[PDB]
Design a protein around this motif. Structure first.
Motif, PDB file in Angstrom:
ATOM      1  N   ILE A  56       9.482   1.278  -7.824  1.00 44.17           N
ATOM      2  CA  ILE A  56       8.460   2.175  -7.087  1.00 44.17           C
ATOM      3  C   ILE A  56       9.411   3.045  -6.091  1.00 44.17           C
ATOM      4  CG2 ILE A  56       6.710   0.709  -6.784  1.00 44.17           C
ATOM      5  CD1 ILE A  56       7.523   0.034  -4.025  1.00 44.17           C
ATOM      6  N   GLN A  57       8.950   4.265  -5.966  1.00 43.03           N
ATOM      7  CA  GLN A  57       9.967   5.291  -5.184  1.00 43.03           C
ATOM      8  C   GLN A  57      10.455   4.851  -4.055  1.00 43.03           C
ATOM      9  OE1 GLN A  57       9.050   9.616  -5.811  1.00 43.03           O
ATOM     10  NE2 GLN A  57      10.969   8.690  -6.475  1.00 43.03           N
ATOM     11  N   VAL A  88       6.097   2.021   6.968  1.00 42.06           N
ATOM     12  CA  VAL A  88       7.090   2.943   7.216  1.00 42.06           C
ATOM     13  C   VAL A  88       6.395   4.501   7.007  1.00 42.06           C
ATOM     14  CG1 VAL A  88       7.815   2.845   4.642  1.00 42.06           C
ATOM     15  CG2 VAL A  88       9.180   4.252   6.296  1.00 42.06           C
ATOM     16  N   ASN A  89       6.602   5.392   7.871  1.00 43.03           N
ATOM     17  CA  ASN A  89       5.854   6.570   7.851  1.00 43.03           C
ATOM     18  C   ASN A  89       7.133   7.699   7.675  1.00 43.03           C
ATOM     19  OD1 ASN A  89       4.470   5.411  10.675  1.00 43.03           O
ATOM     20  ND2 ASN A  89       3.399   5.811   8.953  1.00 43.03           N
ATOM     21  N   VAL A  90       7.005   8.409   6.454  1.00 44.62           N
ATOM     22  CA  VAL A  90       7.878   9.572   6.143  1.00 44.62           C
ATOM     23  C   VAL A  90       7.215  10.580   6.895  1.00 44.62           C
ATOM     24  CG1 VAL A  90       9.209  10.843   4.445  1.00 44.62           C
ATOM     25  CG2 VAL A  90       8.522   8.539   4.037  1.00 44.62           C
ATOM     26  N   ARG A  91       7.653  11.352   7.852  1.00 40.67           N
ATOM     27  CA  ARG A  91       7.213  12.634   8.537  1.00 40.67           C
ATOM     28  C   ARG A  91       8.236  13.545   8.447  1.00 40.67           C
ATOM     29  NH1 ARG A  91       3.271  10.110  12.040  1.00 40.67           N
ATOM     30  NH2 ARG A  91       2.177   8.412  10.743  1.00 40.67           N
ATOM     31  N   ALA A  92       7.652  14.944   8.655  1.00 41.25           N
ATOM     32  CA  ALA A  92       8.810  16.152   8.542  1.00 41.25           C
ATOM     33  C   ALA A  92       9.521  15.937   9.769  1.00 41.25           C
ATOM     34  CB  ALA A  92       7.990  17.355   8.552  1.00 41.25           C
ATOM     35  N   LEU A 148      10.264  10.034  -0.729  1.00 38.91           N
ATOM     36  CA  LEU A 148       8.703  10.627  -0.451  1.00 38.91           C
ATOM     37  C   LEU A 148       8.540  11.854   0.108  1.00 38.91           C
ATOM     38  CD1 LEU A 148       7.195   7.199   0.796  1.00 38.91           C
ATOM     39  CD2 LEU A 148       7.043   7.925  -1.697  1.00 38.91           C
ATOM     40  N   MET A 149       7.350  12.420  -0.053  1.00 35.36           N
ATOM     41  CA  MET A 149       6.963  13.713   0.628  1.00 35.36           C
ATOM     42  C   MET A 149       6.745  13.414   2.108  1.00 35.36           C
ATOM     43  SD  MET A 149       7.973  16.168  -0.983  1.00 35.36           S
ATOM     44  CE  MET A 149       8.181  16.718  -2.631  1.00 35.36           C
ATOM     45  N   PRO A 150       7.043  14.199   3.014  1.00 36.63           N
ATOM     46  CA  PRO A 150       6.420  13.984   4.429  1.00 36.63           C
ATOM     47  C   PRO A 150       4.819  13.841   4.350  1.00 36.63           C
ATOM     48  CG  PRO A 150       7.546  16.057   4.258  1.00 36.63           C
ATOM     49  CD  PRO A 150       7.398  15.717   2.914  1.00 36.63           C
ATOM     50  N   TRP A 175       1.030  -1.280  -0.009  1.00 41.17           N
ATOM     51  CA  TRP A 175       0.040  -0.208  -0.183  1.00 41.17           C
ATOM     52  C   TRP A 175       0.865   1.161   0.007  1.00 41.17           C
ATOM     53  CZ3 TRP A 175      -5.304  -0.509   1.097  1.00 41.17           C
ATOM     54  CH2 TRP A 175      -5.934  -1.690   1.162  1.00 41.17           C
ATOM     55  N   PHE A 176       0.496   2.152  -0.539  1.00 41.49           N
ATOM     56  CA  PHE A 176       1.065   3.512  -0.532  1.00 41.49           C
ATOM     57  C   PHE A 176      -0.086   4.762  -0.190  1.00 41.49           C
ATOM     58  CE2 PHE A 176       2.330   7.265  -3.418  1.00 41.49           C
ATOM     59  CZ  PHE A 176       3.327   7.723  -2.234  1.00 41.49           C
ATOM     60  N   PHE A 177       0.270   5.450   0.684  1.00 45.46           N
ATOM     61  CA  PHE A 177      -0.472   6.629   0.831  1.00 45.46           C
ATOM     62  C   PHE A 177       0.320   7.912   0.523  1.00 45.46           C
ATOM     63  CE2 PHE A 177      -2.084  10.109   3.545  1.00 45.46           C
ATOM     64  CZ  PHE A 177      -3.469   9.746   3.354  1.00 45.46           C
TER      65      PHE A 177
END
Length: 177
Positions: free
Chosen positions: A45-46, A120-124, A51-53, A12-14
């Motif tokens: 895939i990226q 995995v959560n990419v966050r600022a 990825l963006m935050p 999944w990708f959000f």
């Protein structure tokens, strides 16, 4: 002939698009059950580090939704790796790929059935990687998964990682390794 994985998995990708719904933003990219289709997906895939935050990847076993309220998730919890901005270079992509390999390679052996997925959560303010398990009261399973995962990632003894029950989720730790 392709090499079969033990389980069928869903990626999944959000996307963090603020002018879209969350139903719109959350996409099941692909399901796979062979080594060859895993790598085709991963390689095209990226990378996480790009990825963006606010973007997430989740790999879950076929038929578990990447939502803590899911039947298979509601009673469980997660082992949390937290990365700051200095490790967005050295560790994020390595840790994610190693995590995905732990899942699809069945690296937790007799306690494989307790694993639901990983996120995995990419966050600022620093990335997160987590392995999601099915039942937070299964102490032997959770802790074995914990020790094997932390060894696999090569985290030094100075880093202690925690497992939180989803129903708890600062958040208290039920287990630390």
């Amino acid at each position: 002939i392709k090499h079969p994985l033990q389980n069928r998995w869903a990626l999944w990708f959000f996307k963090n698009d603020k002018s879209k719904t969350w139903q719109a933003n959350l996409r099941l990219i692909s399901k796979f059950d062979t080594v060859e289709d895993f790598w085709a997906l991963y390689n095209h895939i990226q990378l996480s580090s790009n990825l963006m935050p606010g973007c997430d990847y989740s790999l879950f076993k076929d038929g578990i939704e990447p939502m803590w309220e899911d039947e298979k998730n509601k009673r469980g919890g997660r082992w949390l790796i937290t990365l700051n901005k200095q490790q967005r270079r050295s560790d994020l992509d390595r840790f994610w790929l190693e995590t995905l390999l732990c899942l699809i390679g069945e690296s937790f052996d007799d306690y494989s059935d307790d694993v639901c997925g990983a996120v995995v959560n990419v966050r600022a303010k620093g990335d997160k990687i987590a392995i999601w398990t099915t039942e937070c009261e299964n102490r032997e399973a959770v802790t074995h998964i914990g020790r094997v995962y932390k060894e696999r990632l090569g985290l030094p003894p100075k880093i202690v990682i925690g497992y939180q029950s989803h129903a708890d989720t600062t958040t208290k730790n039920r287990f630390v390794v």
